[PDB]
Design a protein around this ligand. Structure first.
Ligand SMILES: [Mg+2]
Ligand SMILES: [Mg+2]
Length: 132
RNA sequence: UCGACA
DNA sequence: ATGTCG
């Protein structure tokens, strides 16, 4: 069953690698709670990773125990491992996204959370509410 | 085989 | 339809 009292996050991109953005919404209503400014170059998985970590910080800051839904098996694992195993080359054009990823990893290594990170079951429930 | 992003 | 991220 769907846990309606939750935060759903999803990445959006134009090309992959390409322009990456992401947002978090109230799973029940669809209200947009946060939306990251487009990042010139990044991968889908880096964006999915950044979205979940942003969500963890967002909920922690607001003293919320709501779970987070993501449809990304890859990103869910990276967060659990506290390491984003991306293949994106490291250059001046990808410096911005790599800095954000490194900082998200560092946040995971300096904070604790009880937030359940759940797999959104697209095959059974349709597209995630944070879909672009 | 599967989860995603285009 | 054809690609890339995992
Ligand atoms: Mg997604
Ligand atoms: Mg989507």
């Amino acid at each position: 069953e769907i846990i309606w009292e939750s935060l759903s996050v999803d990445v959006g991109s134009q090309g992959n690698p390409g322009i990456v953005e992401y947002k978090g919404v109230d799973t029940k209503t669809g209200e947009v709670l946060f939306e990251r400014e487009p990042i010139p170059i990044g991968t889908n998985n880096m964006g999915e990773f950044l979205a979940i970590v942003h969500g963890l910080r967002y909920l922690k800051e607001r003293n919320s125990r709501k779970p987070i839904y993501s449809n990304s098996q890859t990103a869910i694992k990276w967060v659990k491992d506290k390491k984003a195993k991306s293949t994106l080359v490291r250059n001046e054009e990808t410096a911005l996204i790599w800095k954000l990823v490194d900082e998200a990893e560092e946040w995971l290594n300096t904070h604790t959370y009880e937030t359940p990170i759940l797999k959104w079951q697209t095959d059974k429930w349709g597209e995630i509410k944070a879909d672009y």
